[PDB]
Amino acid sequence: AKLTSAVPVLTARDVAGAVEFWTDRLGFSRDFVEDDFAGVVRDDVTLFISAVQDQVVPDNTLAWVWVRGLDELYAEWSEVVSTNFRDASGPAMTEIGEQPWGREFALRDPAGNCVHFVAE
Amino acid sequence: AKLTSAVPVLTARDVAGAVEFWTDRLGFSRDFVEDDFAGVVRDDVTLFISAVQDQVVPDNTLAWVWVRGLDELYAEWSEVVSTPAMTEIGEQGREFALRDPAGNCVHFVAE
Ligand SMILES: [Cl-]
Ligand SMILES: [Cl-]
Ligand SMILES: [Cl-]
Ligand SMILES: [Cu+2]
Ligand SMILES: [Cu+2]
């Protein structure tokens, strides 16, 4: 057999709001959207979004995404996402950092999930 | 830019035990292991595992994985996991789901 790809599942109390942010703001496309679950895609990456009732879940939900052209993606999103991450009143992203595992930045979405984007 | 691959982050109150399950029982390899975070890998798929203090998180954590040879993977795991536990294979793609010791539920779908 061969395991070929994986799809992280972000969580949210407001599923429709999460889909709108990932698509209308970050440029992912809607693969499918149901009231309690959805799938969004950009290039070879699909992210699912699932409904939850306890905010503790997205508050502890993470995902990692590998990217060719990290600075370009950061530039695009910097136009529409705040870089004041310590202000958790809304979505925001960090600056690019050089972590042991790679050059990356992270973005906290409106639901609270933290998705890290790392340069290939 | 191009988004090339994604890595789901499973959650666990016991990261080491989750690593033990995914590697010894499910046949993933250890990519790296720290007390509060770890990475396991099989073929092109890497799963990260992060520590949490609230069991509600893994009890609501999901991930999907695509596979060539779904029936072979099911047969391999049916020798080490109760049918942690896994569902039967059913048509939705064709898939089965597996709940790990930490509570995460990962679905495996046939390409
Ligand atoms: Cl984080
Ligand atoms: Cl063992
Ligand atoms: Cl489920
Ligand atoms: Cu944190
Ligand atoms: Cu369920």
Are B23 and B3 within 8 A, CB to CB? no
CA dist A55 → A17, B7, B60 (Å)? 14, 22, 11
The Cα B79–Cα B77 span in angstroms is 5
Enumerate residues 35 to 54 of chain B having a beta carbon within 8 A of any beta carbon in chain A. Answer: 42-48, 50, 52, 54
10 Å CB burial of residue B15 (0-12, 13-18, 19+) is buried
Residue B13 is inside which H or E element, if any? none
CB of A64 within 8 Å of a chain B CB? The answer is yes
Three-state SS for A95? coil
The Cα A87–Cα B101 span in angstroms is 35
The Cα A48–Cα B64 span in angstroms is 9
The Cα B46–Cα B41 span in angstroms is 4
Kindly provide the resolution of this structure in angstroms, with one decimal: 1.6
| Backbone angles phi and psi of A96, in degrees to 5 | -75, 135
10 Å CB burial of residue A53 (0-12, 13-18, 19+) is exposed
Nearest CA in chain A to B71: A1
Place of tokens 């109760």: B82
Are B4 and A66 within 8 A, CB to CB? yes
Note the helical H segments in chain B.
15-20, 70-77
| Yes or no, beta carbons of B2 and A66 under 8 Å apart | no
Tell me how many degrees the CA angle B58-A113-A26 measures, rounded to the nearest 5: 140
The residues facing B94 across adjacent strands are: B91
The Cα A112–Cα A100 span in angstroms is 24
| Yes or no, beta carbons of B66 and A120 under 8 Å apart | no
The Cα B26–Cα A115 span in angstroms is 26
Fold classification of A1-120 (topology level): 2,3-Dihydroxybiphenyl 1,2-Dioxygenase; domain 1 (3.10.180)
Which residues of chain A does B63 touch, with a Cβ-Cβ cutoff of 8 Å?
A: 6-9
| Backbone angles phi and psi of A11, in degrees to 5 | -120, 160
Supply B41's token pair.
């890998």
Nearest to B74 by CA among B4, B82, B57: B82
Fold classification of B1-111 (topology level): 2,3-Dihydroxybiphenyl 1,2-Dioxygenase; domain 1 (3.10.180)
Note the helical H segments in B6-77.
15-20, 70-77
